[PDB]
Each structure stands twice: as C-alpha cells, then as structure tokens.
Amino acid sequence: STGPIPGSRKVYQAGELFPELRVPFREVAVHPSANEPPVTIYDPSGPYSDPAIQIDIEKGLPRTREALVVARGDVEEVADPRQVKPEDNGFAQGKHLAPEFPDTGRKIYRAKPGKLVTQLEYARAGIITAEMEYVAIRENLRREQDRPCVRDGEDFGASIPDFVTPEFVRQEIARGRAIIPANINHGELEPMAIGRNFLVKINANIGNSTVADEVDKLVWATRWGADTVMDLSTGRNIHNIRDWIIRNSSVPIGTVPIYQALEKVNGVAEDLNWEVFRDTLIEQCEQGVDYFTIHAGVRLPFIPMTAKRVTGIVSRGGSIMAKWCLAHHKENFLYERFDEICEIMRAYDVSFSLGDGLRPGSTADANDEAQFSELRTLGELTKVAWKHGVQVMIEGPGHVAMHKIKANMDEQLKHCHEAPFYTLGPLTTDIAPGYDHITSAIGAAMIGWFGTAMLCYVTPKEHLGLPDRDDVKTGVITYKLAAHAADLAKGHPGAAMWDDAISRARFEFRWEDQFNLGLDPETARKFHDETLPKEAHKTAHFCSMCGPKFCSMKISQEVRDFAAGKAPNSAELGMAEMSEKFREQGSEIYLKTE
Amino acid sequence: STGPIPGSRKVYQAGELFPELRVPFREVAVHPSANEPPVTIYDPSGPYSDPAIQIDIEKGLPRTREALVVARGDVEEVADPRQVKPEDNGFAQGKHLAPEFPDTGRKIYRAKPGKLVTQLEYARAGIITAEMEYVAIRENLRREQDRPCVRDGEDFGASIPDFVTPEFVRQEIARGRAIIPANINHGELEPMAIGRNFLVKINANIGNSTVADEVDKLVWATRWGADTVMDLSTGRNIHNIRDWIIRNSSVPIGTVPIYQALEKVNGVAEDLNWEVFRDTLIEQCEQGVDYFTIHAGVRLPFIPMTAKRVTGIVSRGGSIMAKWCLAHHKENFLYERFDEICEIMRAYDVSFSLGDGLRPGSTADANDEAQFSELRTLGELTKVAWKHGVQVMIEGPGHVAMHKIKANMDEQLKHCHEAPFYTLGPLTTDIAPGYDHITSAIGAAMIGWFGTAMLCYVTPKEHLGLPDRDDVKTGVITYKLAAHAADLAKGHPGAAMWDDAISRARFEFRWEDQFNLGLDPETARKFHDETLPKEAHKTAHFCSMCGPKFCSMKISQEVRDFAAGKAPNSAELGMAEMSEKFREQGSEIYLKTE
Ligand code: SF4
Numbered sequence A, B: 001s002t003g004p005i006p007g008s009r010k011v012y013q014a015g016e017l018f019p020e021l022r023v024p025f026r027e028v029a030v031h032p033s034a035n036e037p038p039v040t041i042y043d044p045s046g047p048y049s050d051p052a053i054q055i056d057i058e059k060g061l062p063r064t065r066e067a068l069v070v071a072r073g074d075v076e077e078v079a080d081p082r083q084v085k086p087e088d089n090g091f092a093q094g095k096h097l098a099p100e101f102p103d104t105g106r107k108i109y110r111a112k113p114g115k116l117v118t119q120l121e122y123a124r125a126g127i128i129t130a131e132m133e134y135v136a137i138r139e140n141l142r143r144e145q146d147r148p149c150v151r152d153g154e155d156f157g158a159s160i161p162d163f164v165t166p167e168f169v170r171q172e173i174a175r176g177r178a179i180i181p182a183n184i185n186h187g188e189l190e191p192m193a194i195g196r197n198f199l200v201k202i203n204a205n206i207g208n209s210t211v212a213d214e215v216d217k218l219v220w221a222t223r224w225g226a227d228t229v230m231d232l233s234t235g236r237n238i239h240n241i242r243d244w245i246i247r248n249s250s251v252p253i254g255t256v257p258i259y260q261a262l263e264k265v266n267g268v269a270e271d272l273n274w275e276v277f278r279d280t281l282i283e284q285c286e287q288g289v290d291y292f293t294i295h296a297g298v299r300l301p302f303i304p305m306t307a308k309r310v311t312g313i314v315s316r317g318g319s320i321m322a323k324w325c326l327a328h329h330k331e332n333f334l335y336e337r338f339d340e341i342c343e344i345m346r347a348y349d350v351s352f353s354l355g356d357g358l359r360p361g362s363t364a365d366a367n368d369e370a371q372f373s374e375l376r377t378l379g380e381l382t383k384v385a386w387k388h389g390v391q392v393m394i395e396g397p398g399h400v401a402m403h404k405i406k407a408n409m410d411e412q413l414k415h416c417h418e419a420p421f422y423t424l425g426p427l428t429t430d431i432a433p434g435y436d437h438i439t440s441a442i443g444a445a446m447i448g449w450f451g452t453a454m455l456c457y458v459t460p461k462e463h464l465g466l467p468d469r470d471d472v473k474t475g476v477i478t479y480k481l482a483a484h485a486a487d488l489a490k491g492h493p494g495a496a497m498w499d500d501a502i503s504r505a506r507f508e509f510r511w512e513d514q515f516n517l518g519l520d521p522e523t524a525r526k527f528h529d530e531t532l533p534k535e536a537h538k539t540a541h542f543c544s545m546c547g548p549k550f551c552s553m554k555i556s557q558e559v560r561d562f563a564a565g566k567a568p569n570s571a572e573l574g575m576a577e578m579s580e581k582f583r584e585q586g587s588e589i590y591l592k593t594e
C-alpha cells in the first residue's frame, strides 16, 4: 500500500552542486513544548510515501535521475536495443504470458566508447557526480554541519566521518570501500551508498499471479525500510515481471543472472554457456538492474571440499554452477570469462555482487575450507573487476555461530581489500525454524557492527515456506533495527539521536511522539488514541535542586569520622530539610517544570 | 494448555546416589533409517507434558522433592505457621477475594536451629544433596560420559566441563559461582542450576480474573522453555493468587517482596519499614518462593547520580526505595537490615537475587556512575550474604548498546566475584517498540555468550502494553534460542548436537524430524502432513567417490607447468571419466545410498 508513513511526513533537501536534486527523507515532528527539532529518518520508500505524487504502475515512477545522467554526456542512446525473446519469459504465450510493460517512451542508454561511465571510474578521475552528492546529503540525515552529536561507540578501526561530504563519498568509492549501484538505465532510482563508513543498509527479496501483486511486494518492502530489493523470480515470465518492478522501483534492483539463464535452457544446468549468459546480462543491463549476483567464485577444485559438509552446497545459484562444473569438468565459465563480464557491466554501470556460492547452510559447515577458498577467490576477482572500472561488493554467510562471526569479517577485509560486505544474516543457530528472522538478527547486528555494509534479510518462516505479507514486514523491521543496533554500537553520527529522541519521549510522557518515532509506527500507533490530549510533561530530578548534596556529606563522614555522628550535623539537619521539601512538594522524584 | 509437546515425548532418568529421583527430559526420535539416537532436550514444562500424570490445580502438583528434603533431617515442621492476614490480599473480601487454595494438608518447614539448610551451606560442608545430583543429570541431557561431542567455541575463560558430575555442581555452589533456588517449602519443584558453567537459563514473568487464568500463564510459559517464573503480581489478592501458582509450579518461583509490602501499606512508599517487610518475607518463605529480588543496592547518595539521566530510574521496585529514601533521608533499610534479611532467607533456603534498582532504561543512561555504584554495592552485599550461607545471584541491565555489553560483564565478574548474572536483555536499541523481544535478543545472546547465567525475557510489545498469550510464547522461544545461541558460541557440550541433528535432518530430507527438532515444534509442524510418507534420503557427495582428485592435479599443473597442458593429461582424461559417470548417474551432486 501507499500513502504517507504513519506519524511522519515526506521531506526533501535540495542539492548545492546539483540544484536539481531532491534528496528524500521522512521527518517526525515532536510535541511543540518539547523544544526539540523534528527527527529526520532515512526513507527508501520513494514517491509512494509522498502524497503529492500520483503513482501509476502502468506508467511507472518518474525518471528523476535520467536528466542528470545524460547531462554528463558520457552516455548515448542505443539505436538498436535488445527486443524481448520467447525464452526471456520461459516460452510463455497467450493468456499465460505476463502483461508487457508499455516501455515505448523510455530511452535505453549505453556508454560512449572511450568515455567513463561507472561511479568508480568517475571517482578515480576526481569527478563528483550527481549521485555522489545525492548520497552525501542522504547520509547526513538533514543534520547541520555546524551541529553534530557526541558519538560514543566502537567501529573497530572504521573511517566514519562526523559529516558526509560529496568529496568523502568519492574517496570511498575511489578505493573501492563503497559503491553506488546505479545503472544508467534505471532513471527511477533514488541513489544510495553501500559501505562500512556509512549507514548499514538492508535488502528485501521478491520474485514470482498478477504483476501488480509483484509490484506490491516491492512497495511493501521499501515502505518499511528496505534499502535495496532483489528480484529472485524464477520459472516463466521472468523478463516481463521484472519490467514492472524496475520501472516502479526507486531503490536499487538486484538479480541473479544465472536464474533466468537457467530457465532459457529449460533448467538443464549443463546447457548453460557464455552465449546464453552474455545475452542474459545485456538483457538485464538494458532494463536497469543495478547489480548482479555472479557466482564466479565457485571453482571446479572447490567442489570436493564440500564433500565433508553437513548440509553441503545450499546456495541455489552456487549449486547450479557446481552441477555445471561436474558435467563438463571445465572451470567455472563465469570465472574464465570474468574479464568479458566486466566489459559488459561497465558499459551500463552495473555493480558487482560476488556470490557466496559455497556459503554455509549450517553452523557446522561455517568457516570451512570450501567457504574461505571461494572468499579469497572473490578478492582476486575484486581486483580484476576494479581494474575494469566496475564497482564491487562481496557476499558472505549464512549460518555462523557467534564465536566465528569475527573470523569471517577479518578474512573479508584482508582478502577482499575492504570491499563492501553483503551478508545473509548470519544465522547464529539452526534449531529455530519460524524464528530465523531473530536468530539471524543476532548475527546480522554483530557482523554489521564488525563492519558489514549491507545485510540481506531473513524472513521468520524461511526454513518452513514462502513468506506472507506480514512476515515480509516483520523481516524488514527486524533487519532495520539490527542495522541500527550496529549503527548505534559503531557510534555513527546520527544513531543515538533517534535513540535519545524516543527516550526523552518516554521520559516526558509524550506518548504520541514515542509511537511516531518507533521503527514500526503502524504497530506503535495501534496503542495511540489521536483524540486524547497530546501532553508533554517536562520534569526535573528532585536532587538536582539540592545544593550542597547532604547525602554525600553524611556518607563521607561515617567512613572517616564515626565520632562526629553523635550530634545533629549540618548535613543531618539539611537532610531533614530535603525530606520536608520532598514530602511538601508531593513526594515526587521528578518535579514538573510546567 | 497441557499434553505432550508436539513431536516429542516426556522421558526420565533415575538417580544413582538418590534412586528416588526422576530427572525430566523430552526426547525427539528421528527416522529409523537415519541410524541416529533420539535427541534429548531440556524440558522445564514439568508434569503438564507428561500424559501419565493427571494434574488438578485444585490439588496441586505432587511434592516429589519433599520426601528427600525431610530425609536430610535438617528441617522441622513449623508448629505455628503464619496465617493469612487481610492486607496480604489487599484487604479484599467477599466476592472480590481470590479463591483460597486448599493448603490444608501441606506441611510447612523451617530449618532446625544449628542445622544446615541452604545448598551453599551443604556444598561448603562437602555434602552432595538430592538437588545437586538432580541438576547434574539434567545438565548432561541424558548423554553418556563415554561418548562426548567435539565442542568448538569461546567461553571467555569459563570453566565448563565435558560432563557435569554431582561433585562438580557442589564445587560451583561452594564458590558461589552457581546456585540452586530451592526453598524447603517448594516440594513441587524440579531442581535446576543457574551458573556460567551450565546451560543458559531464561525467565518468564507472570502476575495479576480467575486464578486458573494466572496458573495458565505459568503453564504456558514453562511449556515452551521458561526455566524460572516470577510472580510480579501487584494490587490485591497478591497472596492467594501466588498460592495457586507455587503449588502448581515445578519451576522456581521468583518474587519482588517490596511489591506486596507496598500494597499492605496502601501504595505509600514512605509507610514501608522493617516490620512490614520482615512479615512479607516470612509470608513468602512459608509459601515456597525460591528467590527474592531485593533492591538493597539503592543507597541514598546514589539517587542524585541519576539526576542527569535521560529516562531516570525505570526500575519499579528500585524507584520505590528511591522515593522512600527521599521521604526519610535514612539509608536503604534493605541495606541497613541486610544481615537480618539473610537470617530469614537462610532458614528456608531462599536464594538472593540482588536487584538492579538503578538499571538503565535507555542506551544513553547505560553504564553511568549510578548503575555501576549499585553494582559494586551488590558485590559487597554478595559477600555478606555468602557469609550467612545464602545463595546469591546478581541482576543487571537493561538498555545497553552492543559496544558496552562487554563492559557490563567485566565489572560484574570482578566486583560480584563471579556470582551468577541475571539480565533483563539487554536491549541493544530504543527505537523499536513492539519488537523489543528481538532488540533484546541481540543483547541477551551476546552477554549470555560473555557469561551470563540467566536471561529475563522481554515480550514483543513491552513498551506498548500487556503481552497476550501468543506474545508470551514469542518471548520464551525468542529467549530460548538466544540462550542456545550463547550456548552454541560458548561451545557447551550438548549444543551443537541439536544444531547438527536438525541440520542433517534438512540434508537427508527427513521433513518430520526437522519440524520435531525445531525450538517451536507447534509452529514447525504446521507445515507438516502426518499422512505423507516419512522419507529419509541418505546421500553422499559425488566427489567423495572420486579417488585421485583430478581437479586438483589440473589446477596444480597449470600454475607450475603451463607447458604440460598441450597434451591430454591423465588428469584431463580422468576428468572426462568423471564427467561421464556424473551424467550417467543422473547428473546429481548427491548420489543416494539407499
Ligand atoms: S541530600 Fe537528598 S535531595 Fe540532596 S542530593 Fe542527596 S538525596 Fe538528593
């Protein structure tokens, strides 16, 4: 559903370098007598929360980024785009074929030969793009550079600034420590950053009923805090379904190209080759997929290392490549043709998301040789992708017990050269199906605290079945707090502000504000009556009005001078005064100011 | 509700030193062709899960411990027990007075003068009681001493044994590192241990409708894993309600004596004195309350230290003592009469649970001077209580960000001399009301991993309202996994066994077993059809049947000898063999054994 998020309001901040920009937020005003500024919150929901914008899925979200991508003059319009083929939708026809999105008036772009295109390429060129200033404003949460907040935490050697400037964003991208998944063909996108030195982001998974039901999956997820969304659709209508998704997505769209590639060859893993895969890549690039999960780490001699595992290979896309490597006994062609993949993704600025094909499916299989062999392989591929100018982030576990979480983070930073980490959890235990959104939340907060850039969410009933509309919301909210719990522990400038604002709300009995500042206001406002008086009782501690602290005198006397107690002190009589004033003021610990 | 827990069966193990004992568990049998022993699980649910025992709340659970407490010959029957007074139930009469429990045929015991009574006193005397062997059997999970499991984890210097012997239990109690909350007047109790070197325990809170509805709160909580239960009932009928609870409780019952004491004096905190409090103590001791939460740490000069807090004093019982200390300006009488309190609790073997009166209610107020001042005070009181022969455990936060969790654990171990830790969470963030069962689960697992003995649960909608019947179950399950996630990380002998059993269950497609081993089988079995064939597909990795590993030869050749690749290797031709056999066997990664 759409409409303004309960208890909040969509607000924007314009750009300085790029006055065209309108960075989105949602503010939550507090009670007038609280004397506090409104609380600014990160908002990936997009134009669906803005009551000033009418969204028609048959038309798609307005391409507010397109005007500035062309303005760079590095992109050109593809004279002959790639027409949709029968196998793109699983050879579906007639009434069984998904409704084609009217993408008639949408220009498809490709980089001009010789010209720079990717954010990484711009960054290393000393160029600050529109997207870089966009995420800079967004990361500061509309907070003044003149007024920071005293941060208190442990980021384990991270380089988190007090204020995110567009120049700072460029530098993080320049050294591959942060990425901005922004395909040139995704004009509907509201740019976001992914890095250890920024806010922790989360991902919500959707995929394939009516296409409107699939678009609603996208809207529902992003409404409640999902930063990026992946279309893990399989089977038929993969192409047409994803058309409606990307056109109506303000958040970065992720895919696993081997999914659709496998369907074009009728689920026969050995029928996969470079020919079909290259076609799938270009197909999704011209649609505007911001990042591909490519399992180019699953090398042939890594397969026997999984023979001793308890749950074996649990990655779908990773097991596909495994089955392929067993049928031909030729090296992973995503690895052998990795150079050519980079040349394609660079032309459209598609970010790399190196897959966790050999990730642990149980706590027993965690941190085994098979997992780390792939991990160190991704680090080598990261350098190869970096040298082609393609943005990179690494994917990780999985099912990991807490005492091994730190080990995973250490290996990643060393071997993947501080590239943004992307984790599915991890799940700290395997014994709680139906509550795996909580078992993974424990691990997600920990490794997010250790320095993970983005966290892929885990639905409650994940090892039980498909998630319903309420479990998706449960998953997003659960991972939004886990990301924030990590932000709070890392001492990110703008985390405690939210914590303290709602804490003072409870303290001053400002009920409406306490419910509006809640991570899930819809649930919190269920206990709110909008007709009741919006009160704001500002009080002060009784002892704060006590001058000389008589209680300190007496205790500092009975320890050093037990002889001075045989007489009415100036402290003892002073305490009798406070007892008098306390009871006279109504025997209240917190006396009201107003 | 009662009845056998879904997918499991109540099993017992007899005692060696005490053949009368019947230590309770619930086993979960796996598929016959899996060739695995049944999985033994900790079960605090009591006789309500045993279909061989008819439970009548009007009669109460059978006192199966009573026969062995009297057998020690240290206790005597109180000739004149304490009759229930009007103020015990808040001066309620007629139809507004709760139904009195028919406690006619229940002998009330008190320690004989000069004789030992508490488990600590027995332990330091070199005595192994019936309760000590009871918890030893229970902690081993019916596992053979001949067959341990290779444990892998980090307990931060804990002394966790491979096998819990009754002698080991005594030693932990002897040094105050573990306790067994076992009042002599709680014969219905199935003994349990609380310590860092044992399984992590959890607590569920109940309190005051029909008394049967309150007993159902107790049954519901313990059914799903609650180790101890506290009756935080307030207002009227506090006495009579708690009568039905303790008589029908196989788990240790906890209370906060200042709650009922405050009601006897009509909610006027300043009307509280030693006279009323001593009466309340003896009242609850003769009922069989296993441990009291006493806020004897809230000293008078600690109150002004809370003046700078964001949320101030959030502890109910702790704020009561604060208001009292402001009205008289005399030191906390629970602190000044602490010696006399110990003399009462020792006579009935009531364990100490030193309250967290000045615990943080927000992440901002975490680890402030007010909190730690009380904490170090409890450590001094712990020594005083220890020297009276009273079992002690310490209570902690609260609302703490992850980077401060370790600091809390370090202060506790040092100043409270490795006494069992009892924590309300902690909540890692303050921005997610309605999901505070998850925000606290992150902190509960972490500090439980660091070495917390017991974790007080936090209901989902805790900062929103009262928990319903489903939120209680949600809370218990959430904290049962958080406790296990901590057990798994600490590498407790018997944690990975559960994790691995359910992991092999998923791997061998043994669906029924996967659902039965789930922490919440009732939810997991919802996706289970009992009519479908109970299959058990045991398979093996294809590469495990590969002899010389041709994939290793080829990769170890192309790195050292690129010249040897211009010819069909014995490895290249051997890989063509495996490709052949792989496709001939059905192109399956995991070939079936049967
Ligand atoms: S003397 Fe009384 S009022 Fe003054 S600081 Fe101490 S407790 Fe507070």
Ligand code: SF4
Binding pocket: A300, A301, A303, A304, A329, B542, B543, B544, B546, B547, B549, B550, B551, B552, B575, B578
């Ligand atoms: S040669 Fe083929 S079958 Fe043998 S170990 Fe390597 S991958 Fe497995």
